Structure 1
Amino acid sequence: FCSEADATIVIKQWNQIYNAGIGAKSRWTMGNEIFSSLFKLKPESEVLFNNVNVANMSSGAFHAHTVRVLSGLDMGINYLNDAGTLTSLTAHLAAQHVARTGLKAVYFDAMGKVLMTVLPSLIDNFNPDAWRNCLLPLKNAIAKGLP
């Protein structure tokens, strides 16, 4: 996936803005910013989130969706040094996405650029290279098998 020193940087900068001691309001604030930006790069994808009430991004259903997305992203980040477990974790995330009709791999490319865009606004001394070396293997492993 990515090196231990790179993974160490990513994990530390991530806990900085995301951990168990952070109220969910900042959780879905980040989630709303991330997904609103995804719908601006790829408007065609907003229809895929109709089941979680994307029509109202202030709803309890969509807040919960973004929370479990960021939680899954957090789970992958915190297992960067356990490559065997990360493989299984990303394989499961891939199955949870391949089954969803309308998802193209390009949408995950667009999500990657959103993360590379938003996170520097949130993170002290954001390291885009350490994040690229680690997120891109994550992105592909989740988009593995996507059209």
Structure 2
Amino acid sequence: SECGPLQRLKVKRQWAEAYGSGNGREEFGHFIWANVFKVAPSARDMFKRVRGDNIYTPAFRAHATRVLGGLDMCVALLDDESVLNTQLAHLASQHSSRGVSAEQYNVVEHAVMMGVEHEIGQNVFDKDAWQACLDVITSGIQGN
């Protein structure tokens, strides 16, 4: 599937519902990263500075806050190709010296998809649109 103009609009609205205003964001981020470290417990080591051992701490919750904010910036820019590439390159530099594998980007990809679906319901979740447009995002964070 392709992340076309229609899929970008659908992903935008579905993200806004799942991400919400701010009340469910702590639960939203917790659901995502509990899935990440369950599927890949070995990834916890890269999060030593933000208490990856304990995702219930305020230190990691702020990290999950920043990660979701990064996704929100990308999703809000899916209809703005020029500015989206600039912000994706900024995320790339934030992960450059961390050795994040392409396997892990897909793990977080799947957790984000399970989290949005868990937030808005399998009844409306558009898996093809979400998979194609998160590929565009993660592929930009890995340089290419």
Q: Identify whether the pair has TM-score above 0.5, normalized to the shorter chain.
A: yes
Q: CA RMSD in A?
A: 1.6
Aligned equivalent of 1:130: 129
Question: How many residues end up aligned between the 2 structures?
Answer: 141
**Contact (CA 8 Å) 1:2, 1:80: kept in 2 or not?**
no
The equivalences for 1:1-147 within 5 A come to: 2-19=3-20, 21-23=21-23, 26-100=24-98, 102-124=99-121, 125-144=124-143
Q: Which runs of 5+ in 1 are unaligned?
A: none
Identity %: 33
CA distance in 2, matches of 1:58, 1:114: 17
TM-score, normalisation: structure 1? 0.87
CA distance in 2, matches of 1:6, 1:52: 34
Moved over 4 A (4+): none
CA distance in 2, matches of 1:142, 1:110: 14
Q: Secondary structure at the residue paired with 1:48?
A: helix
TM-score, normalisation: structure 2? 0.89
Q: Which runs of 5+ in 2 are unaligned?
A: none
Cα shift at 1:67: 0.5
